[PDB]
Design a protein around this ligand. Structure first.
Ligand SMILES: O=C(O)c1c(Sc2ccccc2)c2cc(Cl)ccc2n1Cc1ccc(Cl)cc1
Ligand SMILES: O=C(Nc1ccncc1)c1cc([N+](=O)[O-])ccc1Cl
Lengths: 259, 252
């Protein structure tokens, strides 16, 4: 029945609101100039980089950003995990599976919501207080100049679909409850929920975006882009783990990463 | 007007059946042997336990309370789904919704843990098990005292013979407690609790006419509930001193 799906859309939107303080809609207000939010201090060079500790709340310059990006990730992990817990069925699954959905589905979800924070020119940082240009990032040191660039490439392809937060919440769920991830014990109950999530999404996109022909297919097809950018990341991470054996990864991120 | 409260009373009860798979009527049948159709595997000492993972699919004392937490999390989800059926619950400020559940869940979980409990132990795994109280008292410290206070409370609580139709309005009242720290807009909250309480007060009289001042005795147990949770949280404090990083994060 329609009504059962649209009621599941409501439920997940609501959890998404309750688990993610910087929504895409908050993000876009800041990035355009609406008077519902005030303005970001742009960081675009080492000079601005250094009023940045003064103005907005917050060792090589390139690495200090990394360990900042890395701390943001763990907060984002902490946040997606809370959102999964609301996904009907998820907590009832086997527990070894729950950790395997999270461990693999987390990064794909990061880079999806990181797109809400990005436009062609840069990325909000610090709960929106900051904004860091794409040009600054790509100009950093020879391992680090290439970390956020393919994130940007995806985000501009992705943001063109013009999803709002309420669509995103359902698409986030499908991502989590995949069923094709390595090491799952009972894929069938997973697949059964994801079938329900896909149904919900399918309806939701047709209702929210009635002129957007085949947005469902175009949405789901972007699950390929995400996969590939997780792959470049992991590989790129292991380079600096031995360029700077000085630098440390936080334990929960450590667990996520199982080469 | 009493029609609305009788109407609220069944709207909640129906929502409670949809939200909670294992009801007190259901449990009660299993405990008393009345419904002989199925009989729960019982875990009375060590060797019954290791045998129990085979029958009911899921150190020893650690694995036990660890499984005790997995079900809390499941239960929280069933509570949350129920909450959203309470008239006007979803109409409140999303922050106030999160705060009512943040502080309300534990009180509700021991309440419905009481439906699962008699003098001698507690039903486990959707009732397909029964773990003896004496087996859980034999656990290592601090684990041998964990469920002992809860057992104490359930016997007193189960002594007010409440049914699921009662508990349905009761626990609603727990959730609309306007004194949870950090609320932003309390009027609507207290506005719903004063409605739940009217409906609970009527429900107690009609369902328990011979039970004198039961309303009052129910409201007094909410002292024993709050005291229980306080007592619970800081034993999880001293278990943070005795014992995947992904797992710790699912369990907050
Ligand atoms: O998942 C279960 O059914 C369960 C469990 S899980 C378990 C089963 C066997 C050995 C260790 C843990 C449980 C454990 C204890 Cl010490 C007390 C009550 C327990 N239960 C029953 C329970 C039901 C509901 C809620 Cl809210 C919390 C607990
Ligand atoms: O008994 C527990 N939770 C409740 C709360 C309220 N009512 C009934 C049961 C419990 C919780 C945990 N844990 O790891 O959170 C571990 C072991 C037992």
């Amino acid at each position: 029945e329609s009504a059962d799906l649209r009621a599941l859309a409501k439920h997940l939107y609501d959890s998404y609101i309750k688990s993610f303080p910087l929504t895409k809609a908050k993000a876009r207000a800041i990035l355009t100039g609406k008077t519902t939010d005030k303005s970001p201090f742009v960081i675009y060079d080492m000079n601005s980089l250094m009023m940045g500790e003064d103005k907005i709340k917050f060792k090589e310059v390139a690495i200090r950003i990394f360990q900042g990006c890395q701390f943001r990730s763990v907060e984002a992990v902490q946040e997606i995990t809370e959102y999964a817990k609301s996904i009907p069925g998820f907590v009832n699954l086997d527990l070894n599976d729950q950790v395997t959905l999270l461990k693999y589905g987390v990064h794909e979800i990061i880079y999806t919501m990181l797109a809400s924070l990005m436009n062609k020119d840069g990325v909000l940082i610090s709960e929106g207080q900051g904004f860091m240009t794409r040009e600054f990032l790509k100009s950093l040191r020879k391992p680090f100049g290439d970390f956020m660039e393919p994130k940007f490439e995806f985000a501009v392809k992705f943001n063109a679909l013009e999803l709002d937060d309420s669509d995103l919440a359902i698409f986030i769920a499908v991502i989590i409850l995949s069923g094709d991830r390595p090491g799952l014990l009972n894929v069938k109950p997973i697949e059964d929920i994801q079938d329900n999530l896909l149904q919900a999404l399918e309806l939701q996109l047709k209702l929210n975006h009635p002129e957007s022909s085949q947005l469902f297919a175009k949405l789901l097809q972007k699950m390929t882009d995400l996969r590939q950018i997780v792959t470049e990341h992991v590989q790129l991470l292991q380079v600096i783990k031995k360029t700077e054996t000085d630098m440390s990864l936080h334990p929960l991120l450590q667990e996520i990463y199982k080469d």
